[PDB]
Amino acid sequence: MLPAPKNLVVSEVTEDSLRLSWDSPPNWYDSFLIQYQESEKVGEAINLTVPGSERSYDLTGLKPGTEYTVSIYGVYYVALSNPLSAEFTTGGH
């Protein structure tokens, strides 16, 4: 089976930014999908993806004094094309 993740805790709250933090097993995931909308009546829901190598995001650009329905998933990859791999070099020396 594939685990749902655990322990979704917001950490510092303003009018426009939470900081959703969470718990999951290292490596066993690649990315993290975050769906959120107003618990109220909010047109569309918003999705955000973040490297599995992290356990916390700064959800920003939120309306003050509003209820928000958060969800969070872990993402593992079955069907991937093969890689297209290439080297590049930034400016400077």
Taking the complex as a whole, how short is the minimal distance between the CB of residue 3 and a second copy, in angstroms?
Answer: 6
Does residue number 27 form part of the binding site for a second copy (CB under 8 A)?
no
User: 42 vs 68, which CB is nearer to a second copy?
Assistant: 68
Are 52 and 75 spatial neighbours (Cβ–Cβ below 8 Å)? yes
Q: Are the C-beta atoms of residues 36 and 44 closer than 8 Å to each other? A: no
- Interaction with a second copy in 31-70: which residues (CB under 8 A)? 31, 33, 35, 39, 44, 46-49, 51-53, 62-70
**Closest distance to a second copy from the beta carbon of 2 (Å):** 5
